[PDB]
Amino acid sequence: ARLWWTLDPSKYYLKQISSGGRNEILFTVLGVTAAYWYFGNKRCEHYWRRQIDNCQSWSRAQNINGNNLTVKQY
Amino acid sequence: AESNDATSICLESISGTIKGLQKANYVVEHNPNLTSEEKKHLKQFLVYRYNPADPHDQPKYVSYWCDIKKFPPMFLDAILYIKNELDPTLSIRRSCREGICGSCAVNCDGLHTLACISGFNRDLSKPTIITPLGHMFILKDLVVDMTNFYAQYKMIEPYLKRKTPKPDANKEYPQSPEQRALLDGLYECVLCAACSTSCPSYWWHPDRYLGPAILQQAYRWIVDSRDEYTQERIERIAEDVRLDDCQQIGMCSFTCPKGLNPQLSLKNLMDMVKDFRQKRIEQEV
Amino acid sequence: MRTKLYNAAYFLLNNNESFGHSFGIRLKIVGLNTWIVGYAVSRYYFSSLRVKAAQDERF
Amino acid sequence: MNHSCQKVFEGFVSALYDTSYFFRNFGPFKATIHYATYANYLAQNWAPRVSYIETSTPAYTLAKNKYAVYIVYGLIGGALIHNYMLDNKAAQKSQQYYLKHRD
Amino acid sequence: SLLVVSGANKVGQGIIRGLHSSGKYEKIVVADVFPKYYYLERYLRFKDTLTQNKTKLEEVKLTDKTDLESAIKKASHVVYVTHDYYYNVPSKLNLIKHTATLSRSAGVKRLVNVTPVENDHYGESQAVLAATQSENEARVAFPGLVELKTDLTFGQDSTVVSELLTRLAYGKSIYFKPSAHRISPVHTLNVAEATQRILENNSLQNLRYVARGTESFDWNTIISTLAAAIGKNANLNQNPLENIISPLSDNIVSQTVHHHHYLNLTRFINQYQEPKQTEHHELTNLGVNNLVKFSEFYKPNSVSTQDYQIKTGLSHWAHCL
Amino acid sequence: SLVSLFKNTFLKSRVIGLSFQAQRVMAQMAKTDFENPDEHFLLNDAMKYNELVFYGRLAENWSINPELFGKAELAKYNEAKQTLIDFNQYHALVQNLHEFYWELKTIYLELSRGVATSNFHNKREVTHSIIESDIKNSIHKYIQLIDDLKDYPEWQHKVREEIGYYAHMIYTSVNHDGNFPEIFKEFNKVDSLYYF
Amino acid sequence: MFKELIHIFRTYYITFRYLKKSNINFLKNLSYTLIAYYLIINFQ
Amino acid sequence: LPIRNIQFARYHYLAAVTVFTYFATRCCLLDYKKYYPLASVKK
């Protein structure tokens, strides 16, 4: 059998762009900005929460037809 | 007038496979009128027989009991004794009789080899089985269709190509004894295909993958110092899986009756192809 | 046209050390990869199973 | 196969081939496929990367191409650590706010 | 036939014009890397400024050594002209060695290496010695090679002089750290004439020449002369950004702020030293005795700004495209 | 017209830059076989292949603004545009030949699956009529193609060596009885002798 | 790795021979995209 | 020939393979519901 395992990068994808190295910083800036936005939203939603349980938290239920939900004691 | 036959063909295929597994190695006695006492003095050859030209014939082993004290001790001698004395309808290729032409390559009792320079088990108890090369289409008896082998051989351009004119035309392309011994043990191939019919990569991909023998010939024409199309040949053999399919099993060097080492040649070819791929990038810059 | 046939080589070749040595490595790698993929599939399958229901329950 | 089923099968495969050919070679569809193929090629074979073949003498290689990896690592690590610190600060702020509001 | 290696350069353009306007050379082929389309467009739009003759003109892109070798194989005379690009280009040193080697491999009647100082890459350690060693190695690879090291070129076929004229005309500041060594400008026309003589004469037991235009000048004197000729005033070291970043440095910010060609220009101004060596023979030995005097060429008000206009607004970014 | 300036600059840059590469890409495509003519570009190195394929359409279709072009520049752009159109036609031709090759290889693959050792479920002794007709018509088209390439010896030789290989393998897959003489009548003239 | 899996399937399965190098490349691109999506999503 | 940041590429590929395998197989996050019958109890 032939040995083929290796961690080295393939030369097919190792080319540079004409003006220099590949667009690494430009894409990393976008990635960092997107991560900042996403994690900021997640943190804001997560931390500023409380559960308030009282009569005003309950409303009258209804069917998908909009009528009030009541089930008989059949 | 004809109709769909998927179901009938499927049922017949399954049933035939099962029955053949039950009745594998079907054998027919050439001469049933033999007293078991006589068979003590005679050795048994099971010879594969099949005549696709005849629509009523099917493959089968035929059992021949022969006195091994009537002909020399080689597979070809026994085959020809059977043909001439017992049944002259047997078919086999034979030209040289001294292991040079390479036409008589067959599966001599479990190993691909030339039948003319291969002995057989002298013991009278164990039977000897002679069958054609394994993965080659069978034309008749021990004759296979080696046409594809030759067609592949043609694709390597096995002729000296030179890009530089000879300086004087009254001399011979100079080549020192070292550049000649570089070919020793590499130009003796007789194109018997015994090795290539034993290469599993050649079993699986007969067409896309050239055999060990053809690749060894390409290596012979590459390492030759007189030719100047080294890189061109390397690139040509580097396409798809013409060479990459080799898995270095090494059976090719084990079966070669001539003692050659196609495995080493293929290994060197792989190294040269890798270097060619790398330095197509490294050099041109 | 009667299609031609052949005798598969591996059915009629005496077992050799080269076949064993090479196919051993190939089977080692095949077993490794198959084991990994099958473990992944097994975890997926078992996690896909439903929860136990009561006795003689409809819906 | 039966020649009637042969007619049906030939017609069906001809219809499939014609449908595929029309859909691929129609003007707008052809343009869409042609542009999307190149977009996919750009994405797959020219994605952002940190390792690349250096074919230029040290005098002819920019500094950006010698410290791009370090800049990327700095950006990513700083983003992660700053997000962690922001999470801790938000935890403290929320705790203090809801504590001072009641209990 | 002629192959002009790295001819897109302004000095290369001048030499190409000189060779094209002198008949002969049934086919002239210009080979260059052409990094960005701006340079190719510049060369092509120069190609309009040529009186049409029998000579045919063609362009070749030196993407890899295969192209260079193929072009050389189809040539009888070769004229190498350093380069004009810094960063993301093969080299100014390996290129000449490869040219010499390939030329020797496929027999070439004549190989002339023009090496203007203004084009050498002065952003590397021991730039002048690096260039000298590159020339020596190239000569070793091709003993019959002819050498012609020019010393600052003016006229509309120059790199540094044209750059300075554009800067002064637009009022751009100039980071100026002059070196003490004197300068001797040479009109590119005289360089083209010398190249013609080298290509035609043959024999030529003397294989080292230098293009040196009599009158000597200090760097400050040259800038003063150019400013007088263009009709503006020099703005030396007038940009605080330059003072802070010091384009003489090669840090990340310096490279990513200023134009690379401007960096090399100021580094050349700072690291300039006379090219003439005891082994060179002046162009007077090639018969070119009527050299164009630099001072008389750039008389006051003898240069018009409109010959150096550039795109200013976002249209300028079309160059980066 | 700033947008016009940018459009024309983009077109000029891309088209002229690729025109200097079309020779190399076309030569590489010729070098490989017809099974996957773009094999080298997919596996080893994409030497501006996808770029040529994409920008050929733009060269053909997108308009030009000569007032934004010089004289020599406009001549060069027209030359490059013609080169890209030539590449378009060349790619179309190679694609057609490659698809015909794959037709023949499909026929051969059906035969091989028929004679495969693992095929314990679909083993057929006698070739059926449909595949015979397919073989006959495919060989007829192949012979017509070989005839049509009489003015291009290199192309004719490549078409033979590549496509006719599977025709030869199909020839070897079956016995010489039944309708075999009629099916391979055209193949037996010259091609059969070549593949021996 | 992916290359090796495709090579094994091509060399052992006769039916898989039907696929071109182009189709194999399309599968390669889709698999890479799915792997990137998997890596990204698991952390979300 | 030289490859910029080759070691970084090797380690990035190794990390990608490790993370993908970890999430696909969940090798580290086993299930212990099968061991509960074979475990002692407290309280």
Ligand SMILES: CCCCCCCCCCCCCCCCCC(=O)OC[C@H](COP(=O)([O-])OCC(O)COP(=O)([O-])OC[C@@H](COC(=O)CCCCCCCCCCCCCCCCC)OC(=O)CCCCCCCCCCCCCCCCC)OC(=O)CCCCCCCCCCCCCCCCC
């Ligand atoms: C971000 C949010 C918005 C995203 C919007 C995306 C929209 C995409 C629409 C695509 C439409 C079809 C396009 C057809 C092609 C037309 C353009 C063209 O031909 O190229 C021109 C131009 C030059 O091409 P070329 O001359 O042929 O050069 C290549 C040659 O080989 C010659 O090479 P060379 O050596 O000469 O060098 C030339 C160099 C020249 O290149 C450049 O100059 C470009 C450099 C980068 C941009 C620089 C400018 C930055 C500032 C832009 C500011 C814009 C402001 C906009 C304001 C708008 C206000 C309204 O070329 C390159 O290097 C090409 C770069 C390719 C980058 C590909 C990126 C792939 C990955 C993307 C996703 C990454 C996710 C990571 C997540 C990881 C998390 C861990 O290239 C481009 O325009 C590049 C575009 C690349 C991206 C397109 C595809 C994006 C797809 C994203 C994934 C979305 C999936 C969603 C699910 C799917 C269903 C929806």
Ligand SMILES: CCCCCCCCCCCCCCCCCC(=O)OC[C@H](COP(=O)([O-])OCC(O)COP(=O)([O-])OC[C@@H](COC(=O)CCCCCCCCCCCCCCCCC)OC(=O)CCCCCCCCCCCCCCCCC)OC(=O)CCCCCCCCCCCCCCCCC
């Ligand atoms: C020919 C006919 C053959 C018929 C066979 C029929 C077999 C029927 C099987 C029925 C199902 C058995 C399931 C066992 C589950 C075991 C785990 C367990 O208890 O989990 C609890 C399970 C929850 O699972 P989980 O915890 O979420 O995750 C389980 C995972 O396995 C993860 O748990 P873990 O993290 O603890 O995992 C332990 C770790 C352990 O891994 C290791 O460390 C490996 C250690 C290996 C050591 C081996 C030593 C052997 C020694 C060799 C020596 C050779 C010497 C030679 C010398 C030569 C001379 C020198 O990983 C593994 O166990 C590896 C598993 C992956 C397998 C990869 C290969 C897959 C493809 C190949 C399959 C076999 C093909 C054979 C073909 C044969 C052809 C002829 O929940 C239960 O309580 C279920 C209990 C099991 C019953 C399930 C019933 C389902 C019924 C479905 C309806 C259809 C049924 C159809 C039946 C048909 C019958 C004919």
Ligand SMILES: CCCCCCCCCCCCCCCCCC(=O)OC[C@H](COP(=O)([O-])OCC(O)COP(=O)([O-])OC[C@@H](COC(=O)CCCCCCCCCCCCCCCCC)OC(=O)CCCCCCCCCCCCCCCCC)OC(=O)CCCCCCCCCCCCCCCCC
């Ligand atoms: C849900 C999420 C969605 C978003 C994410 C998506 C992610 C997945 C990827 C999707 C990929 C597939 C996309 C769908 C396929 C679209 C096919 C298509 O366009 O069909 C046209 C195509 C017809 O065009 P054709 O046959 O190719 O051309 C001949 C015609 O006679 C026409 O001849 P003509 O000369 O009269 O007109 C030519 C031109 C109109 O000509 C013009 O007016 C000029 C257009 C711009 C030219 C390029 C100037 C670049 C200047 C530099 C910019 C630098 C920016 C900053 C960065 C600097 C540093 C790098 O019209 C086109 O062909 C437009 C095609 C699309 C844009 C091509 C330009 C690419 C480069 C510029 C954009 C990318 C940025 C690159 C930056 C870097 C560059 C180095 O076929 C159709 O008509 C099909 C119609 C039905 C299908 C849907 C149509 C959708 C139309 C969308 C228009 C979008 C316009 C751009 C918006 C940009 C917003 C920021």
Ligand SMILES: CCCCCCCCCCCCCCCCCC(=O)OC[C@H](COP(=O)([O-])OCC(O)COP(=O)([O-])OC[C@@H](COC(=O)CCCCCCCCCCCCCCCCC)OC(=O)CCCCCCCCCCCCCCCCC)OC(=O)CCCCCCCCCCCCCCCCC
């Ligand atoms: C529970 C969750 C859900 C599970 C099911 C999920 C299914 C997902 C979708 C699967 C889609 C599969 C089809 C598309 C792939 C490509 C197929 C293809 O090439 O098409 C043409 C090709 C037919 O080509 P052809 O020209 O007709 O054949 C002649 C060529 O020379 C032939 O040349 P060749 O080399 O191309 O042909 C080789 C061919 C294989 O085809 C063959 O040539 C023969 C197939 C039958 C072999 C049967 C065994 C023969 C005897 C071996 C020894 C067994 C000993 C057992 C007892 C041991 C006792 C100790 O290989 C394949 O089929 C490739 C893919 C195989 C794996 C994927 C399919 C797995 C199906 C598993 C369930 C099957 C149904 C239940 C069975 C059990 C019921 C109790 O395949 C088909 O059309 C048939 C497809 C397969 C049908 C099922 C046959 C049984 C397979 C069992 C495999 C078990 C593996 C172990 C793990 C199983 C875990 C579930």
Ligand SMILES: CCCCCCCCCCCCCCCCCC(=O)OC[C@H](COP(=O)([O-])OCC(O)COP(=O)([O-])OC[C@@H](COC(=O)CCCCCCCCCCCCCCCCC)OC(=O)CCCCCCCCCCCCCCCCC)OC(=O)CCCCCCCCCCCCCCCCC
């Ligand atoms: C219609 C269009 C056509 C559709 C077709 C169908 C398929 C879809 C196609 C769509 C097109 C895009 C497809 C995805 C890209 C595929 C790329 C590919 O296949 O490349 C193979 C190719 C394989 O090559 P290879 O030879 O095998 O080598 C690979 C090795 O991994 C070698 O890798 P490497 O070594 O070069 O590394 C790569 C590099 C790549 O990374 C980057 O540079 C990129 C960075 C992230 C940028 C993210 C930008 C995202 C922007 C998004 C903006 C919003 C978009 C919204 C769009 C909406 C719609 C318009 O990695 C890094 O930079 C490593 C960073 C590690 C950071 C470590 C942190 C350390 C912290 C500690 C610091 C030190 C502390 C010390 C403390 C000491 C205490 C004592 O990959 C590459 O070579 C490129 C690198 C890999 C890039 C992967 C990018 C994946 C992006 C997925 C995006 C999915 C978006 C879905 C959106 C859905 C919306 C609905």
Ligand SMILES: CCCCCCCCCCCCCCCCCC(=O)OC[C@H](COP(=O)(O)OCCN)OC(=O)CCCCCCCCCCCCCCCCC
């Ligand atoms: C090596 C190459 C091949 C590799 C292949 C890899 C495949 C990867 C597949 C990935 C996707 C995995 C999806 C898993 C779905 C499993 C569904 C299933 O059957 O689960 C078991 C289920 C009962 O489970 P559950 O209701 O949860 O009850 C136990 C709870 N403690 O059971 C039931 O409810 C039983 C009813 C549903 C199942 C019906 C199955 C019908 C099969 C018909 C076969 C027809 C062909 C026959 C061929 C032979 C003919 C002679």
Ligand code: HEC
């Ligand atoms: C892409 C790189 C850019 C961008 C973003 C800017 N310019 Fe420059 N510029 C560029 C090139 C290729 C050239 C040609 C230089 C040469 O003659 O070889 C120039 C040139 C100039 C000039 C004239 C020459 C000089 O002054 O050095 C000026 C003036 C100039 N550029 C200015 C300028 C300004 C103000 C920019 C805004 C940031 C700018 N450029 C951007 C390429 C590019």
Ligand code: SF4
């Ligand atoms: S390679 Fe070996 S077995 Fe094959 S023909 Fe040559 S000598 Fe004979």
Ligand code: F3S
């Ligand atoms: S037996 Fe077979 S696959 Fe390779 S090295 Fe030897 S050939």
Ligand code: FES
């Ligand atoms: S019989 Fe002569 S070599 Fe076989």
Ligand SMILES: [Ca+2]
């Ligand atoms: Ca040789």
